[PDB]
């Protein structure tokens, strides 16, 4: 019940600034120090800095001295980090964290936010198109049936996909997005089912692209041929 709820994904232009927020709950905001951490895609964690919410005292990693500003709003129990002079190298997930103190001088980041994906790009937001993935035919002697949704030509990351509004989770694979040469992302979400259980439900993928405020529900028709 310690929760750090970070603002949603953000697309911002090079040379600009972005302010991300971290709304805390389940503990007394002014009684704990908050630290921020960067993670570039496929890379390690980097420490940006820490802030004392009670007086707004700050400590920065010198690598971010010209990049990051931490602030707090005590009245909303919210920490902020502002990143300035943005470049593609600032494209990353940013985490807010709580720093616990144990005995005299033992510190650890005991609770993490879910992270905020910042994409620094000159390109415009583009909502995905969603196409069905439905095979031409099913074998009598294939023991699982498959179908899915192709989520094509969106920008930036991320999209979320659920099946039957979260009710269908078992046998679902949502692949990592691929960057196409167009500079747009594409991803597939698939479901498999034991061939005997296939006919017991319909299958609707629910696609959410927050950066474009796009929500698509696409029913994938089960209809297929016997070989």
């Amino acid at each position: 019940e310690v929760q750090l709820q970070q603002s949603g994904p953000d697309l911002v232009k090079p040379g600009a600034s972005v302010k991300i927020s971290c709304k805390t709950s389940g503990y007394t905001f002014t009684e704990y120090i908050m630290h921020w951490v960067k993670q570039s895609h496929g890379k390690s964690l980097e420490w940006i800095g820490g802030i004392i919410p009670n007086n707004g005292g700050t400590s920065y990693n010198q690598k971010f001295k010209d990049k990051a500003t931490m602030t707090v709003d005590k009245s909303s129990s919210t920490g902020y980090m502002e990143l300035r002079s943005l470049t593609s190298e600032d494209s990353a997930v940013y985490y807010c964290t709580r720093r616990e103190v144990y005995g005299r001088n033992y510190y650890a980041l005991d609770y993490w936010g879910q992270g905020t994906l910042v994409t620094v790009s000159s390109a415009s937001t583009k909502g995905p198109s969603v196409f069905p993935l439905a095979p031409c035919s099913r074998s009598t002697s294939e023991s699982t049936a498959a179908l899915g949704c192709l989520v094509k030509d969106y920008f930036p990351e991320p999209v979320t996909v659920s099946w039957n509004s979260g009710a269908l989770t078992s046998g679902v694979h949502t692949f990592p997005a691929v960057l196409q040469s167009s500079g747009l992302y594409s991803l597939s979400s698939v479901v498999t089912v034991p061939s005997s259980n296939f006919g017991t439900q319909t299958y609707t993928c629910n696609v959410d692209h927050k950066p474009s405020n796009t929500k698509v529900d696409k029913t994938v028709e089960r209809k297929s041929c016997v070989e």
Binding site: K63, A108, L109, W112, F131, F175, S188, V190, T192
Partner: protein, 214 residues
């Protein structure tokens, strides 16, 4: 800055094996060393603080030890949900620095992929592109070759693939390969095939459709 190294970036172990992830600092850090777990969805949790103390909710199969420059995170009997990247972090001095991370996979029995092929939708085709998708479902190990053939001609340069993280239950991978062609190029050919090579298969497996009969 203190440099933190995880000599082993990638570790594979069987369920119930004892696994040890190593961390070394560029100078003595006097036990001021924490461990984090990052799950494949990107969620981060504290595991161990001050070398050896367990965080709230951490199971007792997790332990940590070390001194000076060298530390160990041990998982005493590996479960499938321990699939994650493990990061060490020093606070001996500022700035805080993390190791490069150790990804842990489960070694399990060879499992053949289930292969499916999905033709492009008329909904997509009418706007001038055809995506053909080949799914390899629930296989182990991760190494897998997908070749696209169009009327028996081998394709190159016109496919992209992606692979899931190891599944936290059955310890398998899945892979998606997409062939992208103009509508015009798609309509020039009949037979679309993906050929799959994997250790779990007796020989290469081909899944195909003919645009005619679909």
């Amino acid at each position: 800055d203190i440099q933190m190294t995880q000599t082993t970036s990638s570790l594979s172990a069987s369920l119930g094996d004892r696994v040890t992830i190593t961390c070394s600092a560029s100078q003595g850090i006097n036990n001021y060393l924490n461990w984090y777990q990052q799950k494949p969805d990107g969620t981060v949790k504290l595991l161990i603080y001050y070398t050896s103390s367990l965080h709230s909710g951490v199971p007792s199969r997790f332990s940590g030890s070390g001194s000076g420059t060298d530390y160990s995170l041990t998982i005493s009997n590996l479960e499938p949900e321990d699939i994650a990247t493990y990061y060490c972090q020093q606070y001996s001095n500022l700035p805080y620095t993390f190791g490069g991370g150790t990804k842990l996979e489960i070694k399990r029995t060879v499992a053949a992929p289930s292969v499916f092929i999905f033709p492009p939708s008329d909904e997509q085709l009418k706007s001038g592109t055809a995506s053909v998708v080949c799914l390899l479902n629930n296989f182990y190990p991760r190494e897998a070759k997908v070749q696209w053939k169009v009327d028996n001609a081998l394709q190159s340069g016109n496919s992209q693939e992606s692979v899931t993280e190891q599944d936290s239950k059955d310890s398998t991978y899945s892979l998606s390969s997409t062939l992208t062609l103009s509508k015009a190029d798609y309509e020039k050919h009949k037979v679309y095939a993906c050929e799959v090579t994997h250790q779990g298969l007796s020989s290469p497996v081909t899944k195909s459709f003919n645009r005619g009969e679909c």
